[PDB]
Amino acid sequence: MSIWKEAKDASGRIYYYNTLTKKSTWEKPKELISQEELLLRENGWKAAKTADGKVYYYNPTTRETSWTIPAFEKK
């Protein structure tokens, strides 16, 4: 549902904070990495990165290119 969130530290450092248990972290937990991957599949999207660490998603069926996971409303 929504157990993790993205916040900025005192120096603007990006860290993922769990509000369900009020815990803090900096590395995306597998459950947070396994969901987006599961939405990708359903529509036919893939995730990859560039030489500059640029994360880009593309659809091998329509040859589409997006710089971020397309919004997937409640199916």
Could you tell me where the DSSP H helices lie in the chain? Answer: 30-43
Class of domain 43-75 (CATH, top level): mainly beta
**The CATH number, out of the four listed (2.20.70.10, 2.30.30.40, 1.10.150.130, 3.20.20.370), of the domain defined by the range 4-29:** 2.20.70.10
Backbone φ/ψ region at 35: left (φ over 0), alpha (ψ -120 to 50), beta: alpha
Q: Give 4's strand partners.
A: 18
Beta strands in 9-66 (DSSP E): 14-18, 23-25, 46-49, 55-59, 64-66
Method: NMR
Say which DSSP state 6 is in: E
Q: Which residues, in sequence order, are CB contacts of 47 under 8 Å at separation 6+?
A: 36, 37, 40, 55, 57
Domain with CATH 2.20.70.10 in the chain: 4-29, 43-75
